[PDB]
Design an enzyme around this catalytic site. Structure first.
Site, PDB file in Angstrom:
ATOM      1  N   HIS A 292       7.763  -3.449  20.674  1.00  0.00           N
ATOM      2  CA  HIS A 292       6.825  -3.501  19.509  1.00  0.00           C
ATOM      3  C   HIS A 292       6.950  -2.247  18.652  1.00  0.00           C
ATOM      4  O   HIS A 292       5.936  -1.573  18.376  1.00  0.00           O
ATOM      5  CB  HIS A 292       5.388  -3.683  19.978  1.00  0.00           C
ATOM      6  CG  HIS A 292       5.108  -5.073  20.419  1.00  0.00           C
ATOM      7  ND1 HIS A 292       4.964  -5.397  21.732  1.00  0.00           N
ATOM      8  CD2 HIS A 292       4.967  -6.215  19.719  1.00  0.00           C
ATOM      9  CE1 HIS A 292       4.744  -6.686  21.830  1.00  0.00           C
ATOM     10  NE2 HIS A 292       4.708  -7.200  20.612  1.00  0.00           N
TER      11      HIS A 292
ATOM     12  N   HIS B  96      11.488  -3.938  15.500  1.00  0.00           N
ATOM     13  CA  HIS B  96      10.818  -5.258  15.547  1.00  0.00           C
ATOM     14  C   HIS B  96      10.256  -5.562  14.160  1.00  0.00           C
ATOM     15  O   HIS B  96      10.446  -6.710  13.663  1.00  0.00           O
ATOM     16  CB  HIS B  96       9.730  -5.285  16.619  1.00  0.00           C
ATOM     17  CG  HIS B  96       8.848  -6.484  16.558  1.00  0.00           C
ATOM     18  ND1 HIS B  96       9.286  -7.746  16.896  1.00  0.00           N
ATOM     19  CD2 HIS B  96       7.557  -6.618  16.224  1.00  0.00           C
ATOM     20  CE1 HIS B  96       8.295  -8.605  16.779  1.00  0.00           C
ATOM     21  NE2 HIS B  96       7.234  -7.945  16.351  1.00  0.00           N
TER      22      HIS B  96
ATOM     23  N   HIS C  78       2.912  -5.786  10.482  1.00  0.00           N
ATOM     24  CA  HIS C  78       2.113  -6.725  11.317  1.00  0.00           C
ATOM     25  C   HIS C  78       1.829  -6.149  12.701  1.00  0.00           C
ATOM     26  O   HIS C  78       0.928  -6.692  13.367  1.00  0.00           O
ATOM     27  CB  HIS C  78       2.792  -8.095  11.455  1.00  0.00           C
ATOM     28  CG  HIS C  78       3.860  -8.142  12.493  1.00  0.00           C
ATOM     29  ND1 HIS C  78       5.090  -7.590  12.296  1.00  0.00           N
ATOM     30  CD2 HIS C  78       3.891  -8.706  13.721  1.00  0.00           C
ATOM     31  CE1 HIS C  78       5.834  -7.791  13.376  1.00  0.00           C
ATOM     32  NE2 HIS C  78       5.132  -8.501  14.253  1.00  0.00           N
TER      33      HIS C  78
ATOM     34  N   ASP D 292       7.789 -13.762  13.839  1.00  0.00           N
ATOM     35  CA  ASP D 292       7.384 -12.847  14.922  1.00  0.00           C
ATOM     36  C   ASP D 292       8.197 -13.116  16.178  1.00  0.00           C
ATOM     37  O   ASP D 292       8.412 -12.142  16.936  1.00  0.00           O
ATOM     38  CB  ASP D 292       5.910 -12.977  15.261  1.00  0.00           C
ATOM     39  CG  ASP D 292       5.354 -11.759  15.964  1.00  0.00           C
ATOM     40  OD1 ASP D 292       6.022 -10.721  15.973  1.00  0.00           O
ATOM     41  OD2 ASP D 292       4.256 -11.876  16.487  1.00  0.00           O
TER      42      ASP D 292
ATOM     43  N   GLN E 171      11.082 -17.780  30.862  1.00  0.00           N
ATOM     44  CA  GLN E 171      11.683 -17.960  29.515  1.00  0.00           C
ATOM     45  C   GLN E 171      11.703 -19.457  29.172  1.00  0.00           C
ATOM     46  O   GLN E 171      11.320 -19.792  28.019  1.00  0.00           O
ATOM     47  CB  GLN E 171      13.026 -17.230  29.412  1.00  0.00           C
ATOM     48  CG  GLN E 171      12.864 -15.719  29.290  1.00  0.00           C
ATOM     49  CD  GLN E 171      12.187 -15.355  27.993  1.00  0.00           C
ATOM     50  OE1 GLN E 171      12.779 -15.448  26.926  1.00  0.00           O
ATOM     51  NE2 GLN E 171      10.920 -14.965  28.067  1.00  0.00           N
TER      52      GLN E 171
HETATM   53  C1  IEU Z   1       5.289 -17.064  29.110  1.00  0.00           C
HETATM   54  N1  IEU Z   1       6.109 -16.398  30.069  1.00  0.00           N
HETATM   55  C2  IEU Z   1       5.920 -16.413  31.456  1.00  0.00           C
HETATM   56  C3  IEU Z   1       6.913 -15.567  32.023  1.00  0.00           C
HETATM   57  C4  IEU Z   1       7.090 -15.206  33.408  1.00  0.00           C
HETATM   58  C5  IEU Z   1       8.125 -14.338  33.754  1.00  0.00           C
HETATM   59  C6  IEU Z   1       8.349 -13.955  35.076  1.00  0.00           C
HETATM   60  C7  IEU Z   1       7.525 -14.461  36.081  1.00  0.00           C
HETATM   61  C8  IEU Z   1       6.496 -15.357  35.744  1.00  0.00           C
HETATM   62  C9  IEU Z   1       6.261 -15.739  34.413  1.00  0.00           C
HETATM   63  N2  IEU Z   1       7.749 -15.076  31.028  1.00  0.00           N
HETATM   64  C10 IEU Z   1       7.240 -15.568  29.855  1.00  0.00           C
HETATM   65  C11 IEU Z   1       7.854 -15.238  28.535  1.00  0.00           C
HETATM   66  O1  IEU Z   1       6.908 -14.533  27.719  1.00  0.00           O
HETATM   67  C12 IEU Z   1       7.436 -14.228  26.489  1.00  0.00           C
HETATM   68  N3  IEU Z   1       6.433 -13.802  25.620  1.00  0.00           N
HETATM   69  C13 IEU Z   1       6.814 -13.465  24.369  1.00  0.00           C
HETATM   70  N4  IEU Z   1       5.870 -12.995  23.404  1.00  0.00           N
HETATM   71  C14 IEU Z   1       4.482 -13.101  23.877  1.00  0.00           C
HETATM   72  C15 IEU Z   1       3.520 -12.033  23.342  1.00  0.00           C
HETATM   73  O2  IEU Z   1       4.099 -10.741  23.075  1.00  0.00           O
HETATM   74  C16 IEU Z   1       5.186 -10.876  22.177  1.00  0.00           C
HETATM   75  C17 IEU Z   1       6.283 -11.667  22.887  1.00  0.00           C
HETATM   76  C18 IEU Z   1       8.208 -13.589  23.976  1.00  0.00           C
HETATM   77  C19 IEU Z   1       8.664 -13.294  22.691  1.00  0.00           C
HETATM   78  C20 IEU Z   1       9.968 -13.443  22.347  1.00  0.00           C
HETATM   79 CL1  IEU Z   1      10.448 -13.107  20.753  1.00  0.00          CL
HETATM   80  C21 IEU Z   1      10.907 -13.865  23.298  1.00  0.00           C
HETATM   81  C22 IEU Z   1      10.510 -14.157  24.580  1.00  0.00           C
HETATM   82  C23 IEU Z   1       9.131 -14.047  24.977  1.00  0.00           C
HETATM   83  N5  IEU Z   1       8.749 -14.361  26.278  1.00  0.00           N
HETATM   84 MG    MG Z   2       1.666  -8.324  17.386  1.00  0.00          MG
HETATM   85 ZN    ZN Z   3       5.268  -8.699  16.357  1.00  0.00          ZN
END
Ligand code: IEU
Ligand code: MG
Ligand code: ZN
Length: 313
Positions: A68, A72, A106, A217, A269
């Site tokens: 972040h 980004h 943002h 985002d 993922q």
């Molecule tokens: C949901 N989940 C559950 C798990 C998990 C992993 C290991 C064990 C158990 C569970 N791994 C995810 C992925 O979360 C996740 N979150 C993202 N956001 C969410 C908020 O902050 C900004 C980024 C994100 C953003 C981008 Cl660009 C790309 C990939 C992303 N992957």
């Molecule tokens: Mg944010």
């Molecule tokens: Zn962001």
């Protein structure tokens, strides 16, 4: 006035594509942003002296976190640039101005922790803003920088144009709160299928701009596999740090944030591409067909994560 920015040939061509990576030369990112403002908006949208001062103040108020961070910010603005350029005629002079600035700002002053961590820590920001806590902070930080002497890039707008753009930026930054995305896409999905979606309806535009903000985002999922893969490491480095802090408060973190459960990342993922990313770019493509390559790239990366689980890498 006649002083354009120009990029080396490969950047000049690739910057126009959704999957463009801004690269590892920090010192080129401000010039890349100005270039995008100039083609997307015009060389008159902002006084260059003032834009350059605003850009560098925003940079300074991003922190040295794994994900972040300033890189980004610029990445998410380039994705908005690509959407706005492939949809020339669908957006007002004010929206092109506002959305690039919104995207740069943002995640201002992000510390690499979720809204949940702030509430469980009982961080002062959680008292000030009960919902969309960091996102209300990011807008606050944006207003603060706009009010530094020599930083008002909007000073040439009428009183009411000024208020419209700050309102576009506020809604745009609030919308980056992923808790608000699910309901936003559901409503956009219902409206598109029943045929009630009307882009002259301001409450409808708000929703569409919101989904664009979520799409920009999350754009790390729409890059070439090696970019998507290496960003995922920076995303998890913040998550596992946050989990480390959850354990310090005497709370078992969710598996996502537990570095003990690295093995389950490929599966997590998949959930994320299926639950969040694919739905997001699909609805975005339905509303704005020229944004299809973002959906196509996201699907390629979904398939890349599937291959990782199957031990093919
Ligand atoms: C949901 N989940 C559950 C798990 C998990 C992993 C290991 C064990 C158990 C569970 N791994 C995810 C992925 O979360 C996740 N979150 C993202 N956001 C969410 C908020 O902050 C900004 C980024 C994100 C953003 C981008 Cl660009 C790309 C990939 C992303 N992957
Ligand atoms: Mg944010
Ligand atoms: Zn962001």
């Amino acid at each position: 006035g006649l002083m354009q920015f120009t990029l080396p040939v490969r950047l000049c061509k690739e910057i126009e594509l959704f999957h463009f990576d801004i690269g590892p030369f920090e010192n080129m990112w401000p010039g890349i942003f100005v270039y995008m403002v100039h083609r997307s908006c015009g060389t008159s949208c902002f006084e260059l002296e003032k834009l350059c001062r605003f850009i560098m103040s925003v940079k300074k108020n991003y922190r040295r976190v794994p994900y972040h961070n300033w890189k980004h910010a610029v990445t998410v603005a380039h994705c908005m640039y690509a959407i706005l350029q492939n949809n020339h005629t669908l957006f007002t002079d004010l929206e092109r101005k506002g959305l690039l600035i919104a995207c740069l700002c943002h995640d201002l002053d992000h510390r690499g922790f979720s809204n949940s961590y702030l509430q469980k820590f009982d961080h002062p920001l959680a008292a000030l803003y009960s919902t969309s806590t960091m996102e209300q902070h990011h807008f606050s930080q944006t207003v603060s920088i706009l009010q530094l002497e020599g930083h008002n890039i909007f000073s040439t707008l009428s009183s009411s144009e000024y208020e419209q753009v700050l309102e576009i930026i506020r809604k745009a930054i609030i919308a980056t709160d992923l808790a608000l995305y699910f309901g936003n896409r559901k409503q956009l999905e219902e409206m598109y299928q029943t045929g009630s979606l009307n882009l002259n309806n301001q409450s409808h535009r708000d929703r569409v701009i919101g989904l664009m903000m979520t799409a920009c985002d999350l754009c790390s999922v729409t890059k070439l596999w090696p970019v998507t893969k290496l960003t995922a490491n920076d995303i998890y480095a913040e998550f596992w740090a946050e989990g480390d802090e959850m354990k310090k408060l005497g709370i078992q973190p969710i598996p996502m944030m537990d570095r003990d459960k690295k093995d389950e990342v490929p599966q997590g993922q998949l959930g994320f591409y299926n639950a969040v990313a694919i739905p997001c770019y699909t609805t975005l493509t339905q509303i704005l067909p020229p944004t299809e390559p973002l959906l196509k790239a996201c699907r390629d990366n979904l398939s890349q994560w599937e291959k990782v689980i199957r031990g093919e890498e």
